[PDB]
A paper describes a structure:
Insect Pheromone Binding Proteins (PBPs) and Odorant Binding Proteins (OBPs) are found at very high concentrations (up to 10 μM) in the sensillum lymph of insect antennae. These proteins form a large multigene family of small soluble proteins (~ 15 kDa) believed to function as carrier molecules to transport hydrophobic compounds across the sensillum lymph to the membrane-bound odorant receptors present in olfactory sensory neurons (OSNs). Binding proteins that transport important sex pheromones are colloquially named pheromone binding proteins (PBPs). Here, we have produced a functional recombinant PBP from the horticultural pest, Epiphyas postvittana (EposPBP3), and experimentally solved its apo-structure through X-ray crystallography to a resolution of 2.60 Å.
Crystals belonged to the P43 space group, with two molecules in the asymmetric unit. The overall fold of EposPBP3 is conserved with other insect PBPs/OBPs, consisting of six α-helices stabilized by three disulphide bridges (Cys19–Cys54, Cys50–Cys108, and Cys97–Cys117). In contrast to other PBP/OBP structures available in the PDB, both the N-terminus (residues 1–11) and the C-terminus (residues 129–159, which includes the TEV cleavage site and the C-terminal His-Tag) of EposPBP3 appear to be disordered and therefore were not modelled. This may be a consequence of the packing arrangement of the two molecules in the asymmetric unit that brings the N- and C-termini of both molecules in close proximity, where folded N- or C-terminal parts of each monomer would result in steric clashes that are incompatible with the dimer interface observed in the crystals. Towards the end of the refinement, two residual elongated stretches of electron density that could not be interpreted as protein atoms remained at the dimer interface (between the N- and C-termini of both molecules). These were modelled as PEG fragments originating from the crystallisation solution. The structure obtained for EposPBP3 is therefore best described as an intermediate form between form A (N-terminal extended, and C-terminal helix folded) and form B (N-terminal helix folded, C-terminal extended). However, the top part of the cavity (which surrounds and extends above the functional group of the pheromone) appears significantly wider in EposPBP3 than in BmorPBP1. This results from the combination of four amino acid substitutions between the two proteins (Val53Met, Ile62Leu, Lys110Trp and Ala111Thr), and from a slight variation in the position of the exposed loop located between helix 3 and helix 4.
Numbering used by the authors: 12 to 62, 67 to 128
The structure:
């Protein structure tokens, strides 16, 4: 995950700030997230074989991060609905940033780090 972040950082030539952005993303401050944060999430998603989003590998990643059967299913359900909502976004970098924000914001009522 750090492996995949570090790889993507070198491939896409991102500053150390991408760390600041993903931390901010996670604490639900989206105001300063730019397209490149989207490109980072596409890059990481591909390397984790999460990419259209792959349902099965999503559930695997979720359990892999300590999600039980029930919560993993809820997470991927929320991720799919976000993916549908923003399916029509041209720019696949912007599409990923928007899905990621939709996802993070709508997983509120779930115990998952």
């Amino acid at each position: 995950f750090i492996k995949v972040l570090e790889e993507c950082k070198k491939e896409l030539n991102l500053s150390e700030s991408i760390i600041n952005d993903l931390y901010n993303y996670w604490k639900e401050d989206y105001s300063l997230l730019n397209r490149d944060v989207g490109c980072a999430i596409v890059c990481m998603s591909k390397k984790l074989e999460l990419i259209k989003i792959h349902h099965g590998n999503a559930e695997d990643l979720a359990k892999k991060h300590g999600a039980d059967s029930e919560v993993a299913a809820k997470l991927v359900a929320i991720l799919h609905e976000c993916e549908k909502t923003h399916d029509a976004i041209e720019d696949q970098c912007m599409k990923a940033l928007e899905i990621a924000k939709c996802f993070r914001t709508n997983i509120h009522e779930l115990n998952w780090a």
